[PDB]
Amino acid sequence: PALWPLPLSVKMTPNLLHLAPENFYISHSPNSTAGPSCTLLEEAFRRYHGYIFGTQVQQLLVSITLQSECDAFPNISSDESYTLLVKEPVAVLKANRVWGALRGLETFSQLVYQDSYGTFTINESTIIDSPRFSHRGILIDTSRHYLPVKIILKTLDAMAFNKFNVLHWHIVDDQSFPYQSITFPELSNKGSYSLSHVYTPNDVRMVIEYARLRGIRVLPEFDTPGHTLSWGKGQKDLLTPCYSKLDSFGPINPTLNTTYSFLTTFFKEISEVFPDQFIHLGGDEVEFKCWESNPKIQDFMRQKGFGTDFKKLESFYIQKVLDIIATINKGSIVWQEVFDDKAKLAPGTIVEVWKDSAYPEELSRVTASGFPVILSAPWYLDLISYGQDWRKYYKVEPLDFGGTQKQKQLFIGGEACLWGEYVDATNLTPRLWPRASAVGERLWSSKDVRDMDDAYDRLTRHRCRMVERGIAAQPLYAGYCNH
Amino acid sequence: PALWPLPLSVKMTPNLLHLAPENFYISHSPNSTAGPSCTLLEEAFRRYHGYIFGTQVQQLLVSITLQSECDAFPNISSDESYTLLVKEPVAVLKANRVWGALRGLETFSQLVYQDSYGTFTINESTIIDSPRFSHRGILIDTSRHYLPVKIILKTLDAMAFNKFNVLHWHIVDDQSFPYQSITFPELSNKGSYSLSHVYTPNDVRMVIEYARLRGIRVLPEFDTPGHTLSWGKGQKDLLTPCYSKLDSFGPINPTLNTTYSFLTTFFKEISEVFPDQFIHLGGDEVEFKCWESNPKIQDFMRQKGFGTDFKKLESFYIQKVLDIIATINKGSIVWQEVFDDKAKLAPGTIVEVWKDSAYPEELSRVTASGFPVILSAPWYLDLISYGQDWRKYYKVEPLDFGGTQKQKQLFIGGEACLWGEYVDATNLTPRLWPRASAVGERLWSSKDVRDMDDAYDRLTRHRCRMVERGIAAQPLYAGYCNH
Numbered sequence: 010p011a012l013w014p015l016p017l018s019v020k021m022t023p024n025l026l027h028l029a030p031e032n033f034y035i036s037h038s039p040n041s042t043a044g045p046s047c048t049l050l051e052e053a054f055r056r057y058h059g060y061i062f063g064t065q066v067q068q069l070l071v072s073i074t075l076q077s078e079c080d081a082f083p084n085i086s087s088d089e090s091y092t093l094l095v096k097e098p099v100a101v102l103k104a105n106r107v108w109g110a111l112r113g114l115e116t117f118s119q120l121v122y123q124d125s126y127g128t129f130t131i132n133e134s135t136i137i138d139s140p141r142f143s144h145r146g147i148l149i150d151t152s153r154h155y156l157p158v159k160i161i162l163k164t165l166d167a168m169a170f171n172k173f174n175v176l177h178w179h180i181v182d183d184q185s186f187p188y189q190s191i192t193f194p195e196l197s198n199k200g201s202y203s204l205s206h207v208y209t210p211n212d213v214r215m216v217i218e219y220a221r222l223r224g225i226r227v228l229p230e231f232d233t234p235g236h237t238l239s240w241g242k243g244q245k246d247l248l249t250p251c252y253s254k255l256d257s258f259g260p261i262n263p264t265l266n267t268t269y270s271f272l273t274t275f276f277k278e279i280s281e282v283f284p285d286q287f288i289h290l291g292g293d294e295v296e297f298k299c300w301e302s303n304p305k306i307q308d309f310m311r312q313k314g315f316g317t318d319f320k321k322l323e324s325f326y327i328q329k330v331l332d333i334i335a336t337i338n339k340g341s342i343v344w345q346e347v348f349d350d351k352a353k354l355a356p357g358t359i360v361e362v363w364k365d366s367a368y369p370e371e372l373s374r375v376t377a378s379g380f381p382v383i384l385s386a387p388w389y390l391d392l393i394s395y396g397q398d399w400r401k402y403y404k405v406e407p408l409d410f411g412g413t414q415k416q417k418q419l420f421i422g423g424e425a426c427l428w429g430e431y432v433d434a435t436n437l438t439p440r441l442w443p444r445a446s447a448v449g450e451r452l453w454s455s456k457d458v459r460d461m462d463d464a465y466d467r468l469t470r471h472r473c474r475m476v477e478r479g480i481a482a483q484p485l486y487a488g489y490c491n492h
Numbered sequence: 493p494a495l496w497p498l499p500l501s502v503k504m505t506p507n508l509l510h511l512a513p514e515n516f517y518i519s520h521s522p523n524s525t526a527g528p529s530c531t532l533l534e535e536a537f538r539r540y541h542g543y544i545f546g547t548q549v550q551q552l553l554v555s556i557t558l559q560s561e562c563d564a565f566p567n568i569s570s571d572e573s574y575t576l577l578v579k580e581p582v583a584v585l586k587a588n589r590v591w592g593a594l595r596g597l598e599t600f601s602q603l604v605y606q607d608s609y610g611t612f613t614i615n616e617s618t619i620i621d622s623p624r625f626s627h628r629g630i631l632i633d634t635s636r637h638y639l640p641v642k643i644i645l646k647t648l649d650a651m652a653f654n655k656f657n658v659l660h661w662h663i664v665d666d667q668s669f670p671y672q673s674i675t676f677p678e679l680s681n682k683g684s685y686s687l688s689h690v691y692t693p694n695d696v697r698m699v700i701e702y703a704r705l706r707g708i709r710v711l712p713e714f715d716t717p718g719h720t721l722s723w724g725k726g727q728k729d730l731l732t733p734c735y736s737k738l739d740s741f742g743p744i745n746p747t748l749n750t751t752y753s754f755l756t757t758f759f760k761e762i763s764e765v766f767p768d769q770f771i772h773l774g775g776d777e778v779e780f781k782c783w784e785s786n787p788k789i790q791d792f793m794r795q796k797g798f799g800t801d802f803k804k805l806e807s808f809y810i811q812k813v814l815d816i817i818a819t820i821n822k823g824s825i826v827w828q829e830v831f832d833d834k835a836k837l838a839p840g841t842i843v844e845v846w847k848d849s850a851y852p853e854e855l856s857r858v859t860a861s862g863f864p865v866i867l868s869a870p871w872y873l874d875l876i877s878y879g880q881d882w883r884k885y886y887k888v889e890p891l892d893f894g895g896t897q898k899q900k901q902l903f904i905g906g907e908a909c910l911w912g913e914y915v916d917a918t919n920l921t922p923r924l925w926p927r928a929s930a931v932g933e934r935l936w937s938s939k940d941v942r943d944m945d946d947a948y949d950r951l952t953r954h955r956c957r958m959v960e961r962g963i964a965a966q967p968l969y970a971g972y973c974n975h
């Protein structure tokens with residue numbers, strides 16, 4: 010009886026219906042673009058029947074209206090709207106695509122409950138729902154700490170329970186390179202913490218398909234030019250050597266052709282491994298020091314007439330990378346610095362705003378320039394604090410920044426980020442849930458859903474539900490669960 | 493060979509000795525006051541054999557010098573010192589009491605490591621060790637959230653790995669009364685979150701014996717007169733009705749004869765259930781408004797000539813409870829307010845300093861008045877923050893306050909506290925370890941052990957060892973463990 014996220018339009022009635030575990034079917038409506046050949050739906054039907062059961066409404070008929078997209082990979086443009094008509098003798102779930110059906114199945118399971126005598130019950134009701142924003146993501150960091158594939162899958166399960174639809178996989182960084190590249194086997198061979206802390210091509214396909222079956226996009230992030238210390242272990246001459254030499258290395262060297270030919274071969278591979286339409290190129294916190302200390306780079310700066318402005322060198326670099334992505338049928342997402350340091354961005358390039366200091370203004374600037382924008386700044390869940398910090402994440406109102414409606418339309422969503430300096434398998438799940446659920450509701454539910462007492466009431470029970478489903482979500486406050 | 497806490501004296505040699513898993517015995521020296529009939533040692537030998545193994549030193553002989561105390565419960569006066577002589581063919585662990593042997597076994601297990609080829613190895617070495625402080629505790633809160641017995645047992649194991657010797661069990665409080673009382677069945681029947689959220693007499697015995705086998709004291713805290721809301725559900729007319737009329741209640745009513753007869757009977761039961769010599773009476777955050785609003789109490793204040801000074805009414809209450817404890821062969825521990833509010837305490841009453849505003853001065857006052865003191869103030873592990881907060885707990889130097897040497901001798905130790913408003917079985921362990929390990933080394937090791945790099949280096953490996961032993965201790969920073 011606790012809905013989370015709260016659907017767009019909910020109409021409940023005090024009429025009670027009952028379900029019989031051994032005689033309740035989730036089936037395909039005779040009128041549907043999907044049938045038993047639709048693996049995604051067939052698996053969801055079985056999956057949710059187990060989540061639900063561990064007068065009589067004897068069946069839930071599922072009807073997909075338009076071409077189902079059952080065999081496709083979800084996209085930022087995917088329609089996740091759906092309609093739920095709970096009545097006897099047959100309940101009906103209707104949606105334009107399989108994506109909306111997935112969400113509706115989750116909502117339906119949250120409606121079913123057991124009364125005082127253990128009787129499976131559901132109230133007669135009508136639900137009309139659709140997300141406020143299209144990009145609702147969780148960022149995981151598998152470089153600062155390697156995360157076993159199983160916990161990544163458990164995270165995707167929790168994401169589906171919360172209607173998140175994007176897993177921003179910040180797979181590599183300075184400390185380690187777990188991604189196993191087939192065209193460049195020395196990256197992980199030499200950059201991984203160990204050969205037992207790597208993601209084989211199969212581990213990757215596994216995350217991706219498991220995510221697809223839940224309507225979740227897997228956005229890979231291969232951060233450059235900064236945050237690339239671990240890439241140097243296996244790719245010679247990629248990183249920039251620093252000077253008082255020094256045994257220190259800086260960001261990727263943007264003045265070498267070998268750098269671009271390597272990035273060209275590497276991203277062609279990424280374009281073939283990750284089916285998502287987008288590739289996050291990163292571009293955050295590039296340290297200019299080593300570049301400036303390097304003699305050859307000083308000459309390159311002279312030959313290009315960049316003077317002493319290294320943002321131009323950064324821009325030069327990012328623009329060549331951006332161009333490579335553009336030739337491999339992929340879109341690009343970058344951290345705000347790429348935009349702030351005046352790089353020339355092609356239309357459609359998504360900018361992710363992560364810096365907390367006056368981010369509403371950064372939102373105006375980005376959308377003013379006409380670029381799609383994603384907000385993560387107020388949702389750095391790795392920055393833990395004492396108490397109910399879920400309230401501050403919940404209270405955020407993303408569209409509160411100066412701009413026209415056309416500008417506001419460039420805002421496509423946000424992400425709760427769980428960077429890994431202090432996170433691994435021992436503490437990931439409770440740190441992530443239910444704190445991220447606050448971001449989930451703010452990104453899915455209408456802007457007006459803001460009552461804190463009601464939020465607390467539904468979140469408390471949704472958290473217990475996550476625990477009964479095997480997600481070690483931490484408590485909101487003193488209390489207990491009846492599970 | 494990552495020792496934690498760092499022993500008092502460690503003399504290491506580069507000579508390597510090796511152990512044969514199938515041919516390595518931990519035995520009673522023929523010269524020892526303990527033998528096979530000593531269950532505590534027999535269980536430890538077995539337990540540590542499994543921890544160690546998941547120029548040959550064939551055996552580790554254990555010699556207890558004075559009366560063993562094998563069948564007793566540990567006490568604040570217990571001698572935990574020991575000596576470890578690691579040499580071939582027989583190593584020797586010698587201690588005055590079994591308590592020191594327990595500590596020695598842990599240290600011995602930390603000296604054994606597997607070399608590059610999986611060979612069990614240990615460096616020839618000599619260790620002389622004893623704790624800097626006698627009271628080294630962890631406070632758990634099973635009221636704000638019920639904790640299944642298994643996580644309490646699990647916590648006791650981690651405490652042993654870290655040389656903690658006191659479990660401060662804040663068993664009840666405002667939100668729930670999990671303790672099952674035989675004399676007062678309704679306290680838990682009506683005050684627990686549910687009947688499946690209680691500690692039966694058997695649950696309590698289990699915690700107590702499991703702790704004893706590890707040289708850990710179980711210190712019970714039944715907080716009064718404040719923090720007693722749940723006690724009111726099953727014991728009528730115990731709590732003070734507040735007025736202004738009001739279906740509202742405050743702390744325990746100190747003016748009724750029924751209160752003291754009830755507490756006399758209740759604490760007699762506690763003195764029989766918990767073998768530890770001390771009972772923590774609590775006494776923190778007593779709100780006076782409810783008392784002030786009660787007519788009958790106002791009368792009592794008049795009859796007693798207390799005027800409008802309710803601290804006198806508080807002192808009155810706690811002094812009577814303190815007297816009850818004194819008549820049942822137990823000592824008392826109280827939160828600082830009892831001392832601060834000028835209650836008359838008998839010699840030997842221990843005062844726990846928990847308020848962090850100028851706690852060093854509070855330490856000065858308490859010891860100046862001649863009372864033993866325990867510090868928890870700077871170690872509130874429930875108050876989480878971003879990053880390596882383990883370092884701030886580690887940097888604390890407890891004896892840095894004004895006082896003579898005699899005053900300083902009254903400081904008997906401290907506790908790392910993990911209050912439960914935001915803690916239950918889903919997040920307790922990773923939140924508690926290795927953060928509490930910092931406090932563990934400050935309370936055990938000498939005052940001069942303060943190098944941060946060395947601490948970081950040993951803690952990091954100690955944390956991996958904890959994970960290996962089944963404790964989901966969270967990471968200190970980026971990295972990995974050689975699983």
Ligand SMILES: *[C@@H]1O[C@H](CO)[C@@H](O[C@@H]2O[C@H](CO)[C@@H](O)[C@H](O)[C@H]2NC(C)=O)[C@H](O)[C@H]1NC(C)=O
Nearest residue numbers: 010011020021022023024025026131132133134
């Ligand atoms: C689902 O239906 C039940 C009715 O069977 C609703 O429960 C009733 O709630 C109202 C007001 O809260 C009470 O007056 C009734 O006593 C309840 N029913 C019973 C058992 O008599 C329940 O509120 C409905 N769900 C929602 C949220 O609409």
Ligand SMILES: *[C@@H]1O[C@H](CO)[C@@H](O[C@@H]2O[C@H](CO)[C@@H](O)[C@H](O)[C@H]2NC(C)=O)[C@H](O)[C@H]1NC(C)=O
Nearest residue numbers: 493503504505506507508509607614615616617
């Ligand atoms: C335990 O013994 C080993 C081996 O004698 C010590 O390690 C040697 O340390 C020296 C100098 O630090 C190195 O040159 C050797 O290469 C090491 N031996 C090995 C493993 O090849 C080790 O220091 C001793 N342990 C302690 C803490 O004293």
Ligand SMILES: CC(=O)N[C@H]1C(=O)O[C@H](CO)[C@@H](O)[C@@H]1O
Nearest residue numbers: 293294344363389391428429430
């Ligand atoms: C865009 C981004 O967040 N970059 C870095 C940062 O500034 O903070 C995080 C920790 O909070 C780090 O993990 C990231 O590497």
Ligand SMILES: CC(=O)N[C@H]1C(=O)O[C@H](CO)[C@@H](O)[C@@H]1O
Nearest residue numbers: 776777827846872874911912913
């Ligand atoms: C002595 C003591 O700590 N008393 C209260 C407090 O002030 O802080 C804790 C939370 O940090 C609460 O759980 C305790 O009930």
Ligand SMILES: *[C@@H]1O[C@H](CO)[C@@H](O)[C@H](O)[C@H]1NC(C)=O
Nearest residue numbers: 037038039040041070072101
């Ligand atoms: C399918 O559509 C037809 C025609 O609109 C209608 O008569 C029939 O009742 C529908 N069947 C179901 C199960 O919805």
Ligand SMILES: *[C@@H]1O[C@H](CO)[C@@H](O)[C@H](O)[C@H]1NC(C)=O
Nearest residue numbers: 521522523524553555582584
């Ligand atoms: C026990 O003590 C005796 C007498 O001091 C000594 O001879 C013997 O070696 C000791 N045994 C062991 C195993 O330490």
